[PDB]
Structure formats: C-alpha cells, structure tokens
C-alpha cells in the first residue's frame, strides 16, 4: 500500500539502529571458553575470579555423601546376615552416625568426616556395600566416599565430575563476566553437556581464546588431557583459535615430585632422558626436580602446539595454581597478544 | 546373560539384513536409468541478508514463503522479509549460544535453543504489542540441536542428550520422550502429516518415530559417520540424510533401506544441511567446503552448485511454495537463491 512499505522501512531503521548499539558491545567484549579436563581446578579458578570481582552446589554434594554413609550403615546392620564392623570403636562411631540420622541443618562436623572415613575403611561396612546393591543405595556412594578428604577440606569446590556423579546441574552453559583495565571478558563454562564434545565444541570457533585447565600433578589424566588438547589443536574449525593453557595444581606436583613415591617416568617413559630447558625460569627457591617435572609436562603440550598452526593460532602455557590472583591478568595479557597478533596478521607484518 | 543377549541381536540384525536384501530386486539407478537428466541447474543469489554479527547456525522459512527467521550466535533471532530484505523483528536471546530456530506454521511464534539446553518460545503477536518470550522448555540434559512446531501448542525437540522430546507448550511439560539413539541427535524432520518424524544422530543412524505412540518404528543405517542433517521427501515416504562421511543418502520408509548415494570423489567434507525441492526431484545439500550442491535425487548426478558463501554453510531451506532457497553461513550472511 506504500504505507505498509513505509512502516516496514521505519521498523527496519529502528532495528538497524539497535543493531549498531549491540554491535558496539559485541566487538568490545572478549569471549572465552573455559575447557577444564576432569578434576583440573577450573571451578576453583572460576570461584576466585567471581570473588575478586556452580560453587553453591557444594552443600548438596555433602548432603548426598552423608545420605550414602547413613544408608550403608543402617542397611548393613539390618542385613539378613548382619555384617560385623572389624572395629568395635568403629561400630561406636557408626552408632554416633546412626543417632546423627534425620537432622536438618546438619553442621557436617569434622568428626563426622573422620567418622565417615573410619566407617568406610571398616571392611564390615565395605562387606555391606558388596550387598549394598541388594538394598536401595544412592548411586554416587563409592565415588563420594573415596573422595572424602577432598570434600572435608573447607576450601573444597565441587568439581564437574562430582556435579555429574550427582544430578545438581540443570544449566547447559555457565557464564561469568569480569573486567580488567576496563576491558570486558565473557567467560563460558560448559554445564550439563555429555562428554562427547565433537559437536558442541564447534560453537566456540570464534572465541578470543580457549582456556584449557590441566591438573599437572595427575601422573592417567595428564595423557587424557594431552589427547584432548591435541584434538582441539588439530580440529579444522578450531585451527584459528588460540589456547591459553593453564598447567594447574603446580603445588600438588611439587609435593608429589619431592616425595619420589610416584615416578612421572613410569607414566611418561622419555622423562628419564628429559633435561631441563636451558631457558627455564624456575621459581626463586624450588629445586631442580620440580622444575624438570613442570617443564617436561609443558613440553608435552608445546610439542603438540608447535607441530602445527604456527601463524594461525598460538598456545600460551602458564604454570598456575587454582587460587592465583594473577590468573585474570594472565588471561588479559594473552588476549592482548592474541588480538595484537591478529591485527599484525591483517597488515602482513608477521 | 549378556552374552547370548548380545548374540540374539546379531541374529535379529541378520534377520533384518536378509529381509532387506530380498526386497532389493532392482536399484533405483536401474529404475531411473532411462529418464532424461535435469540438465544444468544454475541458480543465482537474489537477496543477501545482512545484519547478523556472528556465524549463523540455523534458519527456518515461514509457511507464507516470505518471512523467515535466522539464529546467530551473536545472540539474535532476526525475522526477515525476504522480498524487501527488511528486518521485521530483532529478538535478543538470553543465551547467545543458539543452535536451532523454528518458525511456527501459524506465524504466531518462533522457537530457538542451544547450549542452554532450553527451547524458548517467543510470541510475535503479543496483545501488549512487543516481542517477548512466552515459554521456556527446560527438560533436556544436553544442547538443543533442532526444534520444529507441530502447532501453536506442540513442538518436537532434538538434543545432545541423545533423546527427542514432544512438548506441551501450555503446561511447559514434556509429553513424550523418544529414546534409542546412542549419540547426539543432530536434526529432525516432521513428516508432511506430522504423525511421524525422523531424526539423525551421531551414531550414523536415522530413526523413524511415531509422534502419537512414542516409539521407534524403523532404524536406518548405512552412513559411515555422524548424520548432521535430515529431511523428508515431499510425499512423506522417503527421506534424505547428510553425514560427516561426505555423502548424502536417500532412504525409503516402505522398502526400509537405503536407495541411493549422492557422492563425488572431489567432495571430502561433511554435509551440514539437506533439503528437497517442491517436487522432490532436486536434493540440495550444504557442505563444509562453503558450497551447496544440487543433486538429481533420481539419477544421483550433480546438477549444479550454489557458490557464493565465504565460510561454512550451516543451514538450508526451501520455501513452501518452492520458489526460493535460503542458505545460512558462518560468514554471518543469509542468501536467497532462485
């Protein structure tokens, strides 16, 4: 009618106006994928970023672990052939817990944790567990009971595997904003998604960087982390995406390495021939063995990253501990280098 | 015993395989060998839709063959008037990681979802007069890969949690769950009567589901890798699938087996999207190599190419009137071909 066309042109003008504004926000925000290998400390790093500027589910995981212990104990006693605690004192501890049944606002007292661990290592309670399947039992009973020390540590942050053993995650993707030097960063953490990543990982082809968190002190989780990094680094849709690599949990590794109890040589045989790089910058006081260990792990990742994609995308390795307040500045400095290298690429100056 | 339990599935898959081979008496290539080819199909870009900030994952034509909706991971749904290129609505999404969008056949609603695991319904004709979300469908435990309205109050979804679900939009509840796939379900296509639908998954199998009952009727194998896309033949008796194995395949519901393979040596990338023309004679497939090929569905010959995108072609769609094709790309543009 030429007036319908006129009103469709004004509606289009009003949209393209808003699209210009929204385009300003989109181009001035850096988007980050946080990909954490299992039990990597990624959640702890996230909690730190939010505090400085998923964790709340810790109480639920506790509750599940407590329910599991209560069911195993009561059910174990009421079995047709009652299982017998190896230890009468352990049984007394069990009696305490049995009294501790059905109390809301449970304090989760440290004794309770010590009490729980004692009952778990009680072979009679384990014998119940053998027949635990017979009675109704909570599915994540072994997993929670084995990880009791981690849960007891007040600083404990529920890990993704723990959130998956329970069913406390509804949201597919978790978001967290932070700001450094008035630059905006949008970091995305994968929530309820299955462990098959080859499809949903393609959504993050144009993030500024993928923050790969790896628990350095594992050994074989380190080798699993290596395979994942390799697939990410060689995927055709991620070939232009840089990777900020956080070799996390360096404190755990220093502790494990000085002890000698587990030799990285058994899991990675070539270590026995690895010499520390002649350009390594160790911490001021750490000994050569932890420096050799931490740089061998880094060189296992750099060997993958330097084998392909020299000019298109880059790997920024950082020896980190999940509670460093410098993680935010490290991300900022790598993103600056990433964007700087992109613009220099457009001008053919690199 | 799991051992014999697994061994009677070998005989049952042996029973099904010989029963499918008895049916196979002549190849579709032999039935259509003496029909004339379609000749060179040479379509041109008639519209380039500009305005999405980032890669487009999905698009869906309205039933009026004029309006369409597109979803980009900038966090925007845009409803375009394809005739004038004017944008009718710009819907800011709560979660920017959108992977699918759907246009209701009545024009009253659009749906979209993604890594948020939610199917969000948007009312386009609110009595107050502004576009706003009217329903959030939160049941899935994995990313939403595809959604299609049956009507204003019913929508089928497919998810990375290896299931499909039928939803009651009013109650927000999950009415029926379709299980049996053992991989990410990537795409679904409603039969023209909306009594059945097919789904393609990352187990290299397509499954035919009964919407009313809620069970799988038939399972179709033959693809070598993940199926990324699926589409019913216009008569509802067949469907085509596109896979990471660089192959499109046509499957017959009544013969219960593959009929034809659409493949060329020069093609080694996966298919992202497939769609038939109105008559079903042409099968249009979008590829990772930035092109869309036009296949002769009956003769398995390539009839043309839709070149002109500068990045991955993520989605295709043919109008209900068959007048035009729309392609969406990671280059953030939609093109209308004719």
């Amino acid at each position, epitope marked *: 009618q030429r007036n319908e066309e006129k009103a469709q042109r004004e509606a289009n003008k009003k949209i393209e106006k808003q699209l210009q504004k929204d385009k300003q926000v989109y181009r001035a925000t850096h988007r980050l994928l946080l990909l954490g290998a299992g039990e990597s400390g990624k959640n702890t790093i996230v909690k730190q970023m939010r505090i400085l500027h998923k964790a709340t589910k810790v109480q639920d995981i506790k509750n599940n672990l407590k329910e599991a212990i209560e069911t195993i104990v009561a059910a174990m006693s009421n079995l047709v052939p009652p299982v017998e605690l190896a230890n009468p004192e352990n049984q007394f501890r069990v009696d305490y817990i049995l009294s501790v049944m059905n109390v809301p606002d449970f304090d989760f007292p440290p004794e309770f944790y010590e009490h729980a661990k004692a009952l778990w290592e009680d072979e009679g309670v384990r014998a119940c567990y053998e027949r635990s399947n017979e009675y109704q039992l909570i599915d994540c009973a072994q997993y929670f009971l084995d990880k009791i020390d981690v849960i007891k540590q007040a600083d404990y942050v529920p890990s993704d595997q723990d959130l998956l053993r329970c069913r406390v995650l509804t949201s597919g993707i978790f978001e967290t904003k932070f700001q450094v030097d008035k630059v905006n960063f949008h970091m995305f953490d994968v929530g309820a998604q299955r462990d*098959e990543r080859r499809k949903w990982i393609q959504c993050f082809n144009d993030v500024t960087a993928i923050i790969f968190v790896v628990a350095s002190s594992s050994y074989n989780r380190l080798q699993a982390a290596l395979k994942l990094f390799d697939s990410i680094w060689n995927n055709k849709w991620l070939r232009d995406t840089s990777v900020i690599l956080f070799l996390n949990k360096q404190d755990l590794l220093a502790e494990k390495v000085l002890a000698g109890k587990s030799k990285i040589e058994d899991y990675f045989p070539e270590f026995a021939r690895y010499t520390t790089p002649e350009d390594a910058t160790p911490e001021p006081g750490e000994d050569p063995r932890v420096t050799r260990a931490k740089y061998f792990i880094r060189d296992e990742f750099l060997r993958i990253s330097t084998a392909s994609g020299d000019g298109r995308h880059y790997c920024y390795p950082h020896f980190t501990c999940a509670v460093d307040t410098e993680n935010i500045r490290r991300v900022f400095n790598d993103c600056r280098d990433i964007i700087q290298r992109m613009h220099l690429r457009q001008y053919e100056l690199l | 015993e799991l051992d014999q339990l697994r061994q009677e599935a070998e005989q049952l898959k042996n029973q099904i395989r010989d029963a499918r081979k008895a049916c196979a008496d002549a190849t579709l290539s032999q039935i259509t060998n003496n029909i004339d080819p379609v000749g060179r199909i040479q379509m041109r870009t008639r519209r380039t839709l500009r305005g999405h900030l980032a890669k487009i994952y999905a698009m869906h034509w309205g039933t009026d063959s004029r309006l369409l909706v597109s979803a980009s991971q900038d966090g925007k749904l845009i409803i375009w008037d394809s005739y004038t290129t004017n944008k009718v609505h710009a819907i800011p999404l709560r979660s920017s990681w959108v992977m699918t969008c759907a246009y209701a056949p009545s024009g009253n609603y659009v749906a979209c979802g993604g890594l948020d695991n939610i199917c969000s319904i948007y009312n386009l004709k609110t009595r107050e007069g502004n576009v706003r979300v009217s329903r959030e469908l939160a049941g899935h435990t994995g990313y939403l890969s595809c959604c299609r309205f049956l009507d204003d109050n019913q929508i089928v979804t497919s998810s990375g949690d290896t299931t499909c679900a039928l939803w009651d939009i009013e109650t927000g509840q999950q009415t029926t769950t379709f299980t049996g796939h053992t991989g990410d379900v990537m795409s679904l296509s409603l039969a023209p009567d909306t009594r059945l639908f097919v789904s393609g998954a990352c187990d290299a199998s397509a499954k035919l589901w009964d919407v009313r009952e809620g069970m799988c009727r038939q399972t179709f194998t033959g693809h070598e890798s993940d199926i990324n896309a699926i589409c019913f033949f216009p008569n509802g008796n067949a469907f085509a699938t596109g896979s990471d*194995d660089a192959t499109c395949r046509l499957f017959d519901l009544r013969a219960d087996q593959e009929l034809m393979t659409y493949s060329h040596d020069n093609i080694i990338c996966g298919i992202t999207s497939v769609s038939f023309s109105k008559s079903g004679r042409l099968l249009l497939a979008g590829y990772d190599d930035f092109n869309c090929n036009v296949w002769d569905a009956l003769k398995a010959d390539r009839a043309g190419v839709l070149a002109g995108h500068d990045n991955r072609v993520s989605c295709l769609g043919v109008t209900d009137d068959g007048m035009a094709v729309a392609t969406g790309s990671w280059d953030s543009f939609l093109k209308i071909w004719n």
Partner: nanobody
Amino acid sequence: QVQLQESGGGLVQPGGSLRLSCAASGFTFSNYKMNWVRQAPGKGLEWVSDISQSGASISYTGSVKGRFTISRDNAKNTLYLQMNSLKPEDTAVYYCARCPAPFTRDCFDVTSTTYAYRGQGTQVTV
C-alpha cells in the same frame, strides 16, 4: 552399518604375549585413523594407541611404549595390537575405536563412556 569386532585376548602369564585383532566393516577403513583403548576393572576408559590412515603416524600411551605394536592391514580391513611383556596392570577390556570422521587429524570422542564407533571389546587377563 559400522561394526567393529575385536578378536583375541584371554588369559596369559606376566611376560607372555598376545595378538589382538579388529575386523572392521561398514566404512572405508583406509579413510580413518584407528585407536586401541582399554578399560581396566574399576577405572574409566584409557587411550592406549592410535595409527594414521596409511599406517605411518603411530603413537602409544607411555605405559605400553616398547611393549605394544599397533598395525593395520588396509587391504583386509583389520587392525592389530601385538602385546608383548604383558603385566598384570595390562588386564582390561581392550576396544577397537575408530575416529569419528574420515580424513581428519582431530579424533575427539574415542574414550567417551558411550561412543558409537567402538567395538564390544575383548577381555585380556594377565
């Protein structure tokens, strides 16, 4: 239909040898990188070894380097794992696992709990 069926395995003494096989069918074997993966009793799936399409780029997990030898016969659509110097820690179900897409260098989901392009396995007890 894509089918992987592992052959071999059984019971051996420490230091003994064993030769596993993988009969593939339902895909162009030559276009896919192949994997051996295993699941020890109690623990999760762990990658063991892989091999490129032509059989030129080979890789092994650290625990088995020097002991296991992966190989593929592209003419007969068969994958092999010659296992020498077997240790009780090698006891697991060993799975033949194909990378999900052909002509690729990224091979993501082969150790996932549920993964489609992976055989039933074969029990190896040491």
